[model samples]
Target: KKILIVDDEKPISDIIKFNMTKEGYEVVTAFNGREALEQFEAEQPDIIILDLMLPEIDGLEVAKTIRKTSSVPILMLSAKDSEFDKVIGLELGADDYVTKPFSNRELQARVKALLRR
Candidate 1:
């Protein structure tokens, strides 16, 4: 399966990309939200792992924008532990989410679960 990982932090994106690739997935990455939108159009990935704090555009807005045209599963990533972030993300059409500082195993599990549905 194909996965698009969008995060401004290179290290985080790199880790996820490497692990996902290891798990037999085709992974494409974007560092900022504008690039994310562009990559989405170009790659049409099967799933997206989006970070809440993004550059150019925030993840909530990115989710809102993408939700307009597609139902591709979105798994949001946030460092904030606030319920508001979680609720707003879901309201904006994110299918699921994982907080930051998440383990590789947990992220992998979420991605697999979303892919299953």
Candidate 2:
């Protein structure tokens, strides 16, 4: 399975890239929201990890746009801890969510779980 990691925060995406690759999944990356939209179908990823506060396009809008074209799973990334943010993430077509992953095991498990569905 393939995973697309989209975030303006390169370090986190890079860490995710490193960890996901270790788990034996192919990984592609986009540094910003526009690239994420372009890459989504282009990469035909099995799942996506998307940061909410993105430049060019916010992650919710990006998720909504992708939702229109596909049913591929979208996992949201957000710094926000409020229930309000998480509820909105779900409403926007995010398949999964925030207080996002940094733990290597969590990354692999999340990817694996998404792939299984």
Candidate 3:
């Protein structure tokens, strides 16, 4: 399946891209929410890994927009670990949340779990 990784941090995006690629999935990267939305339309990815604090539009807004049009699974990534943030994200239609400082294994596990659902 194809997956999109949207994050302003190149290293984080690259790391996830690399690992996901190794797992034999097509991967696309976007640096901001606007670009991510464009790519989402163009690529029609099966899953999305979104960073909550993004340039232009935040990830929460992006997720909301996507929810309005599609049911594509979204996994939110954020530095904010507050329960409120998690609740907001899930309430916004994200299939899962991965807080920052997350290990690659944890992220991958979350992705796998979401896909399995």
Candidate 4:
């Protein structure tokens, strides 16, 4: 499946890209919300792993915009552990979240589980 990793942190994006590719996924990445939106439209990925804190547009806004037009699955990634963040993301239709400092195993599991559903 095609997965898009959207984050301003190049290393974060690269790590997810490496692991996802190793797990047999086709991966694409974007550095910010605007780039993510462009890639999302052009690539039409099966899933998206998005970071909440971003430049240009925040991840929450990205999720909201995406939900407006598509049912494509979204997995939110953030360092923020606030309940508000979780609630807003879910309310905006994110399928799941992997908080920052997450283990690679946990992230991979969440991605697999979400895709399975």
Off by over 4 Å in 4: none
Predicted candidate 1, C-alpha RMSD: 0.7
- lDDT of each residue in 1-117, candidate 2, tens digit only: 888989988888888899888888899999888999999968899999988888999888899899998999988877865889899889888878856645678767876777788
Q: Give the poorly placed runs of model 3, Cα more than 4 Å off.
A: none
Q: What lDDT is obtained when candidate 3 is compared to the true structure?
A: 0.93
Q: How accurate locally, in lDDT, is each candidate?
A: 0.93, 0.85, 0.93, 0.93
The superposed Cα distance between candidate 2 and the true structure at residue 65, in angstroms, equals: 0.6
For lDDT, candidate 1 versus 2, the one ahead is 1
Reference-based lDDT, residue 100, model 4 = 93
C-alpha RMSD in Å of predicted model 4 compared with the true structure: 0.7
Per-residue lDDT of candidate 1, residues 2-34 (tens digit): 999999999988999989999999999999999
Tens-digit lDDT track of model 4 for 1-117: 999999999988989999999999999999999999999999999999999899999999999999889999999999987888898899889999778988988898999998999
Candidate 1, residue 114: Cα displacement in angstroms equals 0.5
- On residues 65-106, what C-alpha lDDT tens digit does candidate 3 reach at each position? 999999999999889889999999999999888888988888
- Report the error of model 3 at residue 21, Å: 0.8
TM-score computed on alpha carbons, candidate 2: 0.93
Can you give the TM-score per candidate against the true fold?
0.97, 0.93, 0.97, 0.97
